[PDB]
Amino acid sequence: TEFWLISAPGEKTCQQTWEKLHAATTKNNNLAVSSKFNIPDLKVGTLDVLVGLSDELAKLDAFVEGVVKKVAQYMADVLEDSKDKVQENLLASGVDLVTYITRFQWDMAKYPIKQSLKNISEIIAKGVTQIDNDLKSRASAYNNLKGNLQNLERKNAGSLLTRSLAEIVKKDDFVLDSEYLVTLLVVVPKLNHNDWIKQYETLAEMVVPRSSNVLSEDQDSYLCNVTLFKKAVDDFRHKARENKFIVRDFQYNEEEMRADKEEMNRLSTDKKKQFGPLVRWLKVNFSEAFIAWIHIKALRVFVESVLRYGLPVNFQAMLLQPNKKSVKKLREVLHELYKHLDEYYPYVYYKIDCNLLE
Amino acid sequence: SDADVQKQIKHMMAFIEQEANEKAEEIDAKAEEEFNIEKGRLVQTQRLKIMEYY
Amino acid sequence: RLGFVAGVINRERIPTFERMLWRVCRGNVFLRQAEIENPLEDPVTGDYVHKSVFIIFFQGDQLKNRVKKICEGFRASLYPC
């Protein structure tokens, strides 16, 4: 949803220009939603300030739009679930973007009107720059945690051939701690398991009958421990490979199964410890960046009005929400209402777009 | 575009009046700061000079 | 403290030149064009062209750079005075 902020002089009072445009814009058709926009009188000064600000605010506008858009994307990146509630979370002053823009108020406490336009612009620039610095830090932390959780997910993904042994291994299936004895682990496709149950007793010399103990099974395969004498292992593994069986050794590795379980408990918990503060920080940073963006838009309108008419300014600030079916007729009405003042327009024009979240 | 030129002439005539007032306000503000600074520096320096003799 | 620049251009560029001054400056520039009593020769081609003088008045160094940048953009010949 796109909104236009516009301004033009009253002939003797601001009501004359407001009534003429508001009546015409409403009466001809629903060309736009028409309302007053709050811009207060600031302490004006020389053309060196005004012209500098006019271009500097355009750089700041591009920057803050990029920042607040990145905040909206980061909110969608942190909110992995409940994606439909993102617009209900991206609120300014407890209300939706459209409402806040229509009901906009200048923050005289953050931005005292007696200050020069440069000082106001620098307070905005510093505030938004530190929001961007905080976002760089938080995004770096969140993206790394997300990436590390995906590595633990990959380690537990797919069949018995690809998932970690830590989920299925227990000490009771193993023969270990021995001079002459070994345990090995093998994966076999489920169609070959009925042959494997006898074939393992014959793949090497010095293998006992009934040596195979199953850990787990899935839609593709069985994974079993095999117990045997130490001389048998190389022929056993080689002849298993000749018979298409896959070796996947894990001799009750307590350190490896512990490390996967510790990281699962840690990463699953640290995700919440990031997520809660991230949603709260992103809501604050969104509100402040969106508020600051509108303060830049208001300054672009103000500075251009002051340039276009001179320092004793009498411009009304107004908002339009253009109808997509009749925006060309709206442009023609706005030109006709202001043809005496001089894309390009004879009146002051700027736009805002609420589609920060795509 | 003669009427636009006349409007701009009148606007420029307004810009200089308030820029000249802005420069005067900066000079008057600096003069009040420098009044307090010069008075302070002179009084303390001469007080110290007289105090050294005392 | 006011500032100004002055120069000459081929007359056919004046409409776009003047409109761009009123677009780069946010509706604020004083301009006077004036025609030369005769056409003047191009130093490269030898074409005698109906050139016109211009003077542009402003306040401050920020406007100085805008008016100069547009004069350079239309290849207008500036001179000191």
Of residues B5, B9, B16, nearest to C59 (C-beta):
B16
Determine contact: B19 vs chain C, CB below 8 A.
yes
Structure tokens at A141: 């932390």
Quick one: A228 and A306 in the same domain?
Answer: no
Quick one: A219 and A294 in the same domain?
Answer: no
Quick one: A157 and A283 in the same domain?
Answer: yes
Determine contact: B8 vs chain C, CB below 8 A.
yes
Quick one: A156 and A67 in the same domain?
Answer: yes
The domain total for chain A is 3
CA distance A308 to chain C (A): 5
Chains adjacent to A (≥3 CB pairs closer than 8 angstroms): B, C
CA distance B13 to chain A (A): 9
Structure tokens at A160: 């018995």
Whether residues C23 and A51 touch (CB distance < 8 A) is answered with no
d(CA A155, CA A151) in angstroms, rounded, equals 6
End position of a domain, from candidates A251, A282, A299: A251
Q: What are phi and psi of A176, to 5 degrees?
A: -140, -170
Quick one: A62 and A140 in the same domain?
Answer: yes
Q: Between the CA of residue B15 and those of A43, A47, B10, C6, what are the distances in Å? A: 14, 8, 9, 22
Quick one: A345 and A334 in the same domain?
Answer: yes
Task: Spell out which residues of chain C touch residue A50, defining contact as CB-CB under 8 Å.
Answer: 26
Identify the CATH number of the domain in which residue A221 sits: 3.30.70.100
Quick one: A73 and A60 in the same domain?
Answer: yes
Quick one: A20 and A59 in the same domain?
Answer: no
Quick one: A299 and A318 in the same domain?
Answer: no
Whether residues C59 and B8 touch (CB distance < 8 A) is answered with no
Whether residues A46 and B22 touch (CB distance < 8 A) is answered with yes
Determine contact: C16 vs chain B, CB below 8 A.
no
Quick one: A170 and A239 in the same domain?
Answer: yes
Q: Chain C interface, mutation test: which of A46, A47, A299, A309, most C Cβ atoms within 10 Å?
A: A47
Of residues A44, A45, A342, nearest to B4 (C-beta):
A342
C:32-71 residues touching chain A, CB 8 A cutoff:
58-63, 66
d(CA C54, CA C16) in angstroms, rounded, equals 14
Quick one: A110 and A81 in the same domain?
Answer: yes
- What stretches of C1-81 adopt beta strand conformation (E)? 2-10, 30-35, 40-41, 48-49, 51-59, 77-79
Location of structure tokens 């720059």: A129
Whether residues B12 and C27 touch (CB distance < 8 A) is answered with no
Q: Give the residue from chain C lying closest to A300, CA to CA.
A: C26
Residue of A309, A51, B11, A46 whose CA lies nearest to C1:
A46
Give residue A19's domain range.
1-38+313-354
Compute how many other C-beta atoms are within 10 angstroms of the C-beta atom of residue A51. Answer: 24
End position of a domain, from candidates A198, A231, A251: A251
Determine contact: B10 vs chain C, CB below 8 A.
no
Output the CA angle A103-A108-A114, nearest 5 degrees. Answer: 135
Residue of A74, A42, A72 whose CA lies nearest to A57:
A42
Whether residues A311 and B4 touch (CB distance < 8 A) is answered with no
Whether residues A310 and B10 touch (CB distance < 8 A) is answered with yes
Of residues A48, A308, A344, nearest to C62 (C-beta):
A48
Identify the CATH number of the domain in which residue A107 sits: 1.20.1460.10
Whether residues C30 and B8 touch (CB distance < 8 A) is answered with yes
Q: Between the CA of residue B52 and those of A187, A355, B43, B47, B49, what are the distances in Å? A: 100, 74, 14, 9, 5
Determine contact: B15 vs chain C, CB below 8 A.
yes
Compute how many other C-beta atoms are within 10 angstroms of the C-beta atom of residue A208. Answer: 12
Q: Chain A interface, mutation test: which of C62, C65, C66, C68, most A Cβ atoms within 10 Å?
A: C62
Q: Which residues contact A66 (CB under 8 A, 6 or more apart)?
A: none
Q: Which residues contact A58 (CB under 8 A, 6 or more apart)?
A: A300
Quick one: A117 and A83 in the same domain?
Answer: yes
End position of a domain, from candidates A251, A275, A304: A251
**In Å, what resolution does this model reach?**
3.8
Q: Chain B interface, mutation test: which of A11, A46, A306, A315, most B Cβ atoms within 10 Å?
A: A46
Q: Chain C interface, mutation test: which of B7, B10, B13, B15, most C Cβ atoms within 10 Å?
A: B15
SS3 letters across chain A = CEEEEEEEECCCCHHHHHHHHHHHHHHCCCCEEEEECCCCCCECCCHHHHHHHHHHHHHHHHHHHHHHHHHHHHHHHHCCCCHHHHHHHCCECCECHHHHHHCCCCCCCCCCCCCEHHHHHHHHHHHHHHHHHHHHHHHHHHHHHHHHHHHHHHHCCCCCCCCCHHHCCCHHHCCCCCCCEEEEEEEEECCCHHHHHHHHHHCCCCCCCCCEEEEEECCCEEEEEEEEEHHHHHHHHHHHHHCCCEECCCCCCHHHHHHHHHHHHHHHHHHHHHHHHHHHHHHHHHHHHHHHHHHHHHHHHHHHHHHHHCCCCCEEEEEEEECCCCHHHHHHHHHHHHHHHCCCCCCEEEEEECHHHC
Q: What are phi and psi of A353, to 5 degrees?
A: -125, 120
Residue of A44, A215, A103 whose CA lies nearest to B19:
A44
CA distance C29 to chain B (A): 7
